[PDB]
Write a protein that binds this ligand. Structure first.
Ligand SMILES: CSCC[C@H](N)C(=O)NS(=O)(=O)OC[C@H]1O[C@@H](n2cnc3c(N)ncnc32)[C@H](O)[C@@H]1O
Length: 498
């Protein structure tokens, strides 16, 4: 159906990536996976921002060309995205030929339109003896005419109040940068060579941010021979996920660029806060030890919308223990044991309102599914997952309330025992569906133990809509590890310090 395009920032390859950059790439992966499962036609881009002064310095310290240096880095990044199961449809690098060409043409085009002019870069109280300020950047530089599109950008902001999420960040951009008056922007540099040369004046390289921002267009084939993906996906729904500290580049410079090139503006910028480790933690270490799905769950659940989030060893191990192993794992494990013991693995047909608590569980499942969808559309994963774990929580309660082991010792309550059992399986099926974007492997294994096929859609989900003639596995396997909580905390702290 409808077209949906989601992008990460293209990260600087200036080191080995920590949780920080993993966070955003996993977050966009979750959204892409979800949108696909909701029957959208989806494109998901990530990649690397390879030009710049610092990168060139690194390469010379290493004793190799810039190209070979960034080639070194790109291999490591692709390896990490492989580890974290990132389902990007394309990976873009700014040293890719097709990209560098388009950047050159765009710059030239803008110059021909007088949207870029040639002026003098200048600016920065101590004075000399003639009142001149001593304590100075000074070069020739091209300037982008942001001032000329200020009114038009203000209109855009006012007509699209949900252009940036969460609420408040759009007003911050207005107050701090736009309403006071946009200055024209220096979009070239001359103090280094590692960049896209301005054709008409090769001593200037394009400012890395203009070069970088265009990645979102060029990856689709903008201003190239094969441009089907641009016409499709750029004219559909376009989301850019970014960290708050690069919001001005994406909310001011990028929209105005797109105005000058006469193409559609994106529909949403999702700006998020910082992940802080409490002091560096590498994805591989965590994935090797406890697996991928814990990491993805942890990162997505622990960065709240509108604020920063914090990692601790205690919280990481605690959530695996309580939220995954106990809340979800034991629920599955004991659901499967009881279906075996009482109905020889055959899950009874689903009949609504057999016990007193049935209608209550059903109303909670409907609420959890609706809340999940609301929060996923807003890209609020903590709240999305909270809704999932509300259903888990109420399903564990439902076991306590119906007391299957009491029902089983009375032959007149067989229909009730059966309804408990079908309601447990049905509940866990819904849960395995809701978590799939976050925890693909966990989802599959949960469903396998219930004798169900892996998820294929998230449309039209409900508790009652359960397949007939289902048989659970004869023997259950734990989906999560049983941790030595003190040892694992001490292990994580050891890896961080050492
Ligand atoms: C056209 S987009 C150009 C982006 C630019 N190259 C850049 O900026 N690169 S970066 O390597 O600095 O990556 C910054 C982004 O990585 C993510 N990031 C890095 N560290 C963290 C962190 N600790 N918590 C959350 N996100 C983080 C956010 O998405 C930031 O916006």
């Amino acid at each position: 159906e409808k077209n949906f395009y989601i992008t990460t920032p293209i990260y600087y390859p200036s080191g080995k990536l920590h949780i920080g950059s993993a966070y955003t790439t996993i977050a966009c992966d979750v959204l892409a996976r979800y949108k696909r499962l909701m029957g959208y036609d989806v494109f998901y881009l990530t990649g690397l921002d390879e030009h710049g002064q610092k990168i060139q310095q690194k390469a010379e310290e290493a004793g190799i060309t810039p190209q070979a240096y960034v080639d070194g880095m790109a291999v490591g990044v692709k390896e990490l995205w492989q580890l974290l199961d990132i389902s990007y449809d394309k990976f873009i690098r700014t040293t890719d030929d097709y990209h560098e060409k388009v950047v050159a043409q765009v710059f030239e085009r803008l110059l021909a339109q007088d949207d870029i002019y040639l002026g003098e870069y200048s600016g920065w109280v101590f004075r000399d003896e003639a009142g001149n300020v001593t304590g100075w950047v000074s070069e020739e530089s091209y300037f982008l005419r942001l001032s000329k599109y200020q009114d038009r950008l203000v209109e855009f902001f006012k007509a699209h109040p949900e252009f940036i999420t969460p609420d408040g960040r759009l007003n911050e951009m207005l107050r701090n940068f736009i309403e006071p008056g946009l200055e024209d922007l220096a979009v070239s540099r001359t103090t280094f060579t590692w960049g896209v040369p301005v054709p008409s004046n090769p001593k200037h390289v394009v400012y890395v941010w203009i070069d970088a921002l265009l990645n979102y267009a060029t990856a689709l084939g903008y201003a190239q021979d094969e441009h089907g993906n641009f016409d499709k996906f750029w004219n559909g729904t376009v989301f850019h996920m970014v960290g708050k500290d690069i919001l001005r580049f994406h909310s001011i410079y990028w929209p105005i660029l797109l105005m000058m090139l006469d193409v559609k503006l994106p529909d949403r910028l999702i700006a998020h806060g910082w992940f802080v480790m409490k002091n560096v933690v590498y994805p591989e270490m965590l994935v090797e030890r406890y697996g991928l799905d814990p990491l993805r769950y942890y990162l997505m659940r622990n960065l709240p919308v509108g604020s920063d989030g914090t990692f601790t060893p205690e919280d990481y191990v605690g959530r695996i223990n309580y939220e995954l192993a106990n809340d979800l794992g034991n629920l599955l494990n004991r659901t499967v044991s009881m279906i075996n013991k009482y109905f020889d693995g055959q899950i009874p047909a689903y009949v609504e309102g057999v016990t007193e608590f049935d209608h209550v569980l059903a109303e909670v499942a409907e609420q959890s599914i609706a809340d999940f969808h609301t929060h996923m559309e807003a890209v609020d994963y903590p709240r999305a997952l909270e809704a999932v774990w509300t259903l888990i929580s109420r399903t564990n309660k439902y076991i306590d309330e119906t007391a299957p082991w009491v029902l089983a010792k009375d032959e007149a309550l067989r229909d009730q025992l059966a309804s408990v059992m079908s309601h447990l399986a049905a509940s866990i099926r819904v849960v395995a569906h809701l978590i799939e974007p976050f925890m693909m492997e966990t989802s599959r294994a949960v469903l396998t133990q219930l004798g169900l096929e892996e998820v294929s859609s998230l449309e039209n989900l409900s508790l009652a809509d359960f397949p007939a003639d289902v048989t659970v596995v004869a023997k259950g396997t734990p989906i999560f590890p049983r941790l030595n909580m003190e040892e694992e905390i001490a292990y994580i702290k050891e890896q961080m310090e050492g």
